[PDB]
Design a protein around this nucleic acid. Structure first.
Length: 159
DNA sequence: GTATTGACTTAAAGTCTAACCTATAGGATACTTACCAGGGACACGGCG
């Protein structure tokens, strides 16, 4: 499941290159602690393989998720609760879930709304963060690189 | 030099319209008790 040199996805930092694994015996138990490095924060995260999936670490998603997110980007007829607070909480929880589909839907909806009439700074921050993580994830999804990943995001949002 | 009229242009309003401040309201997971002096004089509570 976990192999050296694999570009594994760890939430909510997106891509996270593995380096190695260490015994790190604690309580007399050589609990395996595999080490990930994320290029965004330049931090190392050591996680246990036995419950690694419990935290939410996932491998690079294939092309099935790629076409899924494209189709979802072409999913119309979205309505939100009237109050701004409720919809903000909903999309923030959607981002926190780490599900690629949920964050993609949040990003697209917020971007279409912002481009519709322009909103605010907090929504802008949410959109920037979510778009950043999505572009990184897609870049590694097809190893298409961050710049070309941003451009493909920019063409596909056009529909 | 000091008495005028007839144009000829000009700033200051005086006002109508538009945008950019301003007073105000609201927001529904759940959260329930904060934080180094002395030296003299006067007044208040205990004890006998």
């Amino acid at each position: 499941i976990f192999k050296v040199g694999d570009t594994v996805v760890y939430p909510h930092h997106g891509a996270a290159l593995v380096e190695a694994i260490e015994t790190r015996t604690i309580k007399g138990e050589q609990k395996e602690y595999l080490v990930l490095k994320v290029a965004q924060g330049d931090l190392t995260v050591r996680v246990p393989a036995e419950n690694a999936e419990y935290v939410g670490v996932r491998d690079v998603v294939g092309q099935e998720g790629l076409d899924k997110v494209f189709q979802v980007l072409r999913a119309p007829h979205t309505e939100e609760p009237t109050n701004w607070s409720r919809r903000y909480k909903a999309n923030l929880e959607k981002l926190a879930s780490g599900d690629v589909n949920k964050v993609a839907e949040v990003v697209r909806d917020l971007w279409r709304r912002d481009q519709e009439r322009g909103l605010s700074a907090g929504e802008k921050r949410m959109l920037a963060k979510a778009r950043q993580i999505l572009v990184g994830e897609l870049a590694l999804a097809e190893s298409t690189d961050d710049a070309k990943a941003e451009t493909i995001l920019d063409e596909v949002l056009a529909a």
